Design an enzyme around this catalytic site. Structure first.
Site, short mmCIF file in Angstrom:
data_model
loop_
_atom_site.label_atom_id
_atom_site.label_comp_id
_atom_site.label_asym_id
_atom_site.label_seq_id
_atom_site.Cartn_x
_atom_site.Cartn_y
_atom_site.Cartn_z
N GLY A 1 0.80 -1.22 0.00
CA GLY A 1 0.00 0.00 0.00
C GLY A 1 0.83 1.27 0.00
N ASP B 1 -2.37 10.39 5.99
CA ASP B 1 -2.94 9.15 5.48
C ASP B 1 -3.45 8.26 6.62
OD1 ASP B 1 -3.78 7.58 3.28
OD2 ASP B 1 -1.80 6.68 2.94
#
Ligand code: 76Q
Length: 283
Positions: free
Chosen positions: A28, A138
């Protein structure tokens, strides 16, 4: 803080030549994670444009040197030996909050009691970053890791920023389904981390992913409007994979999530207020 410089070949040897088969760990943060055993400890080895990818690698190390807390993943070392950069962390045996909420690979559902502790630990980790003038950028359930005791560990500081108002940027980064309206337009502020944390709290209450293309609403943040228009209530969205969730503490967590998800950045609570409210919920 100063970290151990690991050899690429030592990392290649302990991870079985960076094997892509399951059991590789996940992927990711512009890189794949692999399991390994080094210096008598289980570790997680992250193998990462080429120049933009090195900035993500340097930023993780810089933020990790400055930021050490019970609720942040610990960086053990790194590897610059060549051009396939590796970051070495303490191994988190329970994976991510995303995988645990989805019961990926047959793991048991998290209890409400474990979820409340995870919400508090994650908020304590974000508080430490904000106190130290850092913006994560994030915050999401895939970036909340769980250790042997299910203690929440904030991870992935590649996009993090120091502050050390409101600044703007031309390269908008983060995960769409968790991003505040101002962050999607290029603003850089700690108020955007609060908003994204509000989406994490909705995933914890419901066990539903932030985005699901085969669902209505497709975006989890839209349930806030369905509940506010009195079409539904938070009780209709509670994760049924728990036996210990009482309506009072669930509504107290939902109230924090609702405040976090305010569309106007200045109307959202700061992290210290989020932390206080989550402590009063248990207590
Ligand atoms: C599909 N799994 C996604 C989450 C797992 C990623 C993951 C696991 C883990 C892996 C699997 C396959 C299963 C379990 C139970 C734990 C374990 N330890 C980790 C330590 C650090 C970082 C990290 C990575 N990047 C940046 C960091 O700062 C830390 C990620 C880790």
């Amino acid at each position: 803080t100063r970290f151990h410089s690991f050899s690429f070949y030592e990392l290649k040897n302990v991870t079985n030549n960076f094997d892509e088969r399951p059991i590789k760990m996940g992927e990711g943060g512009f890189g794949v994670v692999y399991k390994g055993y080094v210096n008598n400890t289980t570790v997680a080895v992250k193998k990462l444009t080429t120049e933009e990818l090195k900035q993500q690698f340097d930023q993780e190390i810089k933020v990790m040197a400055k930021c050490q807390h019970e609720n942040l993943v610990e960086l053990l070392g790194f590897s610059s030996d060549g051009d396939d950069l590796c970051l070495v962390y303490v191994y988190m045996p329970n994976g991510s909050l995303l995988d645990r909420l989805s019961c990926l690979d047959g793991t048991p559902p998290l209890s409400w009691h474990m979820r409340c502790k995870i919400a508090q630990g994650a908020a304590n980790g974000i508080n430490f970053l904000h106190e130290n003038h850092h913006i994560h950028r994030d915050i999401k359930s895939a970036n909340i890791l769980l250790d042997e005791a299910f203690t929440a560990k904030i991870s992935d500081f590649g996009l993090a920023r120091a502050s050390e108002q409101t600044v703007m940027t031309s390269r908008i980064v983060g995960t769409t389904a968790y991003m505040a309206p101002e962050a999607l337009r290029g603003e850089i502020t700690p108020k955007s981390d609060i908003y994204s944390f509000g989406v994490v709290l909705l995933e914890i209450i419901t066990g539903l992913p932030a985005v699901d293309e085969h669902r209505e609403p497709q975006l989890l943040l839209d349930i806030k409007e369905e509940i506010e228009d009195e079409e539904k209530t938070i009780e209709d969205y509670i994760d049924k994979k728990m036996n210990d969730a009482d309506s009072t503490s669930v509504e107290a967590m939902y109230s924090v999530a609702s405040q976090c998800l305010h569309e106007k950045k200045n109307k959202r609570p700061d992290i210290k207020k989020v932390q206080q409210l989550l402590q009063e919920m248990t207590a």
